[PDB]
Amino acid sequence: PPGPPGPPGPPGPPGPPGPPGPPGPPGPP
Amino acid sequence: PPGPPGPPGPPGPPGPPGPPGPPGPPGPP
Amino acid sequence: PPGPPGPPGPPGPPGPPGPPGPPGPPGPP
Numbered sequence: 001p002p003g004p005p006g007p008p009g010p011p012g013p014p015g016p017p018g019p020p021g022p023p024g025p026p027g028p029p
Numbered sequence: 030p031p032g033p034p035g036p037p038g039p040p041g042p043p044g045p046p047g048p049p050g051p052p053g054p055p056g057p058p
Numbered sequence: 059p060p061g062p063p064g065p066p067g068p069p070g071p072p073g074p075p076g077p078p079g080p081p082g083p084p085g086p087p
Contacts, residue, residue, distance in 0.1 A: 027083045040071075
C-alpha cells in the first residue's frame with residue numbers, strides 16, 4: 001500500500017518590512 | 030507506491046522593521 | 059516509501075513599525 005506522508009515542508013519566507021515610524025518631535029524654538 | 034506529499038511548512042519569520050518616520054514639525058517661534 | 063516533502067509554508071507577518079523620525083527644524087525667529 002502507499003507509503004506514509006512525506007515530511008512537512010520548510011518554513012516560508014520572511015514577511016514584508018513593517019510600516020514607517022511616526023513623525024519625529026517638534027524642533028527647537 | 031510512495032505516500033502523499035507532506036503538509037505545508039510553517040509560516041516564515043516576521044519581516045524587519047519599517048523605515049524611520051518623517052522629521053517632525055518646525056519648532057515654535 | 060514516504061512521500062515527498064510538502065511545500066514551503068506561507069510568508070511571515072509584516073515587521074514592526076520603524077523608529078520615530080528625527081526632530082523637525084528650529085522655529086522661525
